[PDB]
């Protein structure tokens, strides 16, 4: 199974900051990465598909980039809406795997 390692495990930043979560894959997965956001006690919300294309209904400040091993999820300005755990899911191949997750915190 393709293994997703997501860094950093916990990140603390203030409102209005810019953050760059990174996700790395054991095997090259082209651009088939999805970025999800889960608030505590809430279902995760799909944010990024095709590693750059934002899901409709998601704030435009979210952005994704990278291919192959490296993937970067960048938020230009943080808000209390942005403070939730972030996951990276590869869908290049079956037996889909999720990243450990990043706990974005105030």
């Amino acid at each position: 199974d393709i293994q997703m390692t997501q860094s950093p495990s916990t990140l603390s930043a203030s409102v209005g900051d810019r953050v760059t979560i990174t996700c790395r894959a054991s095997q090259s997965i082209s651009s088939w990465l999805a970025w999800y956001q889960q608030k505590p006690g809430k279902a995760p919300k799909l944010l990024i598909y095709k590693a750059s294309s934002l899901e409709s209904g998601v704030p435009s400040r979210f952005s994704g980039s990278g291919s192959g091993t490296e993937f970067t999820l960048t938020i230009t300005s943080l808000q209390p809406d942005d403070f939730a755990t972030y996951y990276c899911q590869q869908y290049d191949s079956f037996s889909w795997t999720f990243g450990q997750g990043t706990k974005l915190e105030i």
Binding site: W32, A43, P44, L46, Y49, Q89
Partner: peptide, 20 residues
């Protein structure tokens, strides 16, 4: 346990998630 739906084709990402 989350119920999820995902589209066909190359888009295998879980676009919809159940409450749990």
């Amino acid at each position: 346990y989350y119920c999820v739906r995902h589209p066909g084709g190359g888009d295998w990402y879980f676009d919809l998630w159940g409450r749990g």
